[PDB]
């Protein structure tokens, strides 16, 4: 992926 960002952003919101 384009770094461990998308899943962190998901983790933050939800
Ligand atoms: C996909 C990361 C942002 C979701 C709110």
Query: What is the general shape?
Result: elongated
Helix content: 55-70%
Please state roughly what percent of the residues sit in beta strands, choosing from under 5%, 5-15%, 15-25%, 25-35%, 35-45% or over 45%: under 5%
Major sheet description: none
Distance between the termini: 20 Å
The count of helical stretches stands at: 1
* Annotation, overall tally of beta strands: 0
Helix and strand string, N-terminal first?
H
Small molecules bound in the structure, each named once: pentane
Roughly how many Å is the radius of gyration?
7 Å
Which structural class do you get from the secondary structure elements? mainly alpha
Structural notes for this entry:
This protein is mainly α and 14 residues long. It has one helix and no strands. The longest helix has 8 residues, at 6-13. Bound molecules: pentane. Pentane binds at residues 6, 9-10, 13.
Brief account:
This protein is mainly α. It has one helix and no strands. The termini are far apart.
Strand and helix layout:
Elements: H1 6-13
The protein binds pentane.
Pentane is lined by residues 6, 9-10, 13.
PDB class: antagonist
Keywords: covalently constrained helix, antagonist
Assembly: monomeric
């Amino acid at each position: 992926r384009a770094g461990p960002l998308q899943w962190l952003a998901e983790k933050y919101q939800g």
